[PDB]
Symmetry: C2
Subunit: 401 residues, 2 copies
């Protein structure tokens, strides 16, 4: 029989080329081997528009209920997209929405192949970015103060005690931004990072600009230091690993020189930008896994890249594309593995191990999409289009099973 699942995955569909490839993955790589159970939520742009973005919230609720989600790449619509699709508004990033609702830390890890050298000469070991998923400027308040004025932040507690601080007082057109985070969210971030480091036996590096931000960034620094001292110090020393804190400018300068091999903990914004820099440098944003690990027990595996508009238009014209589906594949395998772990269904986990291994073997053997063929050494034997590539992996799986 096919591999059986005890609990369904929550499945969040997406946009454009990634939407096109998603059912081909299911058809060729999963359904022939697994009696795949999912709760399906279409987060394509048109369905988010139809439902006034309720579908996004509903999907996040389902992840909370079942425990594990898999997410396809989506469009966060700018005004071009609004015009292209005739949208009601510039709907908020669905990633930002899910992360807000679930909380946690997003772990981003390169999917490494031996035949692609990183951009950064020194890198010999993967660098994992642990990005705080919650708060900061992903939930902002902003004012365009067209006549200027006294610009303040204000906090009013339960009890009515008001605290005010002045940003600046200006007599000219100005812009203002406010952000927050929570002590609890930061603590869970620190914990997730330290636990990841211990599990994987890698050092943890964290950095902020605590010299400039003497209460906000300072609070991250203190919380990591205290959690580390009180909960992890001994565990780390027994495991032969270290926690290193520095300033953000110093850590980035080090990253250009390091051999790699650590967990790089980042505040939300830093992690968003830096995970993309690391992904690119190792080879591709499609060669990078992404998992949100919530302290509340939820997991969301996603393809953390664009939807490939140019390739989608080509596809609709009957042209084959060089789209790299690896991140999409690893979102499914990561999610099915976790679901299998939680459910105590190890045949599912073993399948996921196999498909991941097959994907790497295929690329390392010189059979790959065009983006990878551009940067590998030695030269690829054969460039496979996105659909041929998926078809090839399906043939390898059939030969296993």
């Amino acid at each position: 029989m096919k591999i059986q699942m005890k609990t369904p995955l929550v499945e969040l569909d997406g946009d454009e080329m990634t939407r096109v490839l998603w059912p081909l993955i299911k058809d060729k790589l999963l359904l022939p081997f697994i009696d795949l159970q999912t709760e399906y939520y279409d987060l394509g742009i048109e369905e988010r528009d139809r439902t006034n973005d309720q579908i996004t919230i509903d999907a996040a609720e389902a992840i909370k209920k079942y425990g594990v989600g898999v997410k396809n790449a989506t469009i966060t619509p700018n005004q071009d997209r609004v015009e292209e699709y005739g949208l009601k508004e510039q709907w908020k990033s669905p990633n930002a929405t899910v992360r807000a609702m679930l909380d946690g830390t997003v772990f981003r890890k390169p999917i490494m192949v031996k035949n692609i050298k990183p951009s950064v000469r020194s890198w010999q070991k993967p660098i994992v970015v642990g990005r705080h998923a919650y708060g900061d400027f992903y939930k902002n308040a902003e004012i365009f103060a067209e006549a200027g004025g006294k610009l303040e932040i204000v906090v009013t507690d339960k009890n009515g005690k008001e605290t005010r601080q002045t940003i600046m007082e200006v007599d000219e057109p100005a812009i203002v931004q406010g952000i927050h985070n929570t002590v609890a969210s930061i603590g869970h971030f620190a914990r997730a990072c330290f636990e990841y480091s211990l599990d994987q036996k890698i050092d943890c590096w964290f950095a902020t600009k605590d010299t400039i931000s003497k209460q906000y960034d300072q609070r991250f620094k203190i919380i990591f230091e205290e959690i580390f001292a009180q909960e992890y110090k001994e565990k780390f020393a027994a495991a032969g690993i270290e926690y290193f804190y520095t300033l953000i400018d110093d850590v980035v300068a080090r990253m250009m020189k390091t051999e790699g091999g650590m967990l790089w903990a980042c505040k939300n914004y830093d992690g968003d930008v830096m995970s993309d820099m690391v992904a690119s440098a190792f080879g591709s944003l499609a060669m990078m896994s992404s998992v949100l690990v919530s302290p509340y027990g939820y997991f969301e595996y996603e393809a953390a890249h664009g939807t490939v508009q140019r390739h989608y238009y080509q596809h609709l014209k009957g042209e084959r594309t060089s789209t790299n589906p690896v991140a999409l594949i690893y979102a499914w395998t990561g999610a099915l593995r976790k679901r299998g772990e939680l459910d105590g269904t190890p045949d599912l986990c073993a399948f996921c191990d196999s498909l991941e291994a097959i994907t790497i073997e295929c690329i390392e053997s010189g059979y790959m999409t065009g983006d990878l063929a551009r940067i590998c050494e030695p030269a690829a034997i054969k460039v496979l289009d996105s659909i041929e590539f998926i078809d090839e992996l399906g043939k390898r799986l059939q030969q296993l099973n």
Copy 2:
């Protein structure tokens, strides 16, 4: 004999190892050749402490008066530094104070040598970072809301009208930050970058996260777009160069694959971090120049790196150090060159071009500090300690009969 100056440079001294090397540069590389005129401001941590940080303000005022400053590396003190030096308080970043007082854009360019390949394989051409010098979180207001509450930004105008926006309402301990910028400062930032791109004949790339920050970052995007359309589109076309706007995560991915050769315009924070990433990748933080170009006509050249506490402590024990003084040197040559341009004293500019060239040629001939010798190819001929390095450049200057 010695080259004459018309107008003094404003000289801002600093801390630790950089403070140690600063007179050696003057003594062996400047004073023998130039009747150096400076107005001296000691921004060492102890003078800042003694004057309650007034000396920083006074120095910024002297830059406004004379037009050009040269700044040594300084400590921005955390509580560890407070303890170390017995300070009254964690004095605010003097760089932030100076930038706030002058406004402008900080241009950060690698100091490239033929025998050092960049960390990023694709880079074949310099990348300049143009960092907006004003506002954002460098002038923050922050609250530790130990009881939570309604967290807001509030704008109270000249005429009454209160505008409030809610960040979040929480029932748990939380932290709150507010920042600002001005439309005028942003515009001056866009113009400085467009002018720099024209003058250097290089493309301009700018990026934010306007998809998430739909008024704040968006206002940067808009101001750039409008200034470019109104004031630079035709000039760019004429010069064969482009302005490219994208999202910040996209630009960083591109930076790992580009050949280089553009001006990368950055918001204040992005510029702080990304100028150091570019500097490190090209070779060292010490191999990066830094000039604040104010819209009000002032210039501040600095050594934009650390003060090297560990080396300082070794130096006090009479031990040799591997501190790289090139950025200190280039701060001086850059400031003196500008001083000479403004004063119409071209012999000073000539000397500055010569000292930069001599420094480059020293390193390219295999004589360099430890940091460079770790990454150069072929192997260094002789690794010089910081002071041996300055002394070598001195020897060369004298050999060339400057």
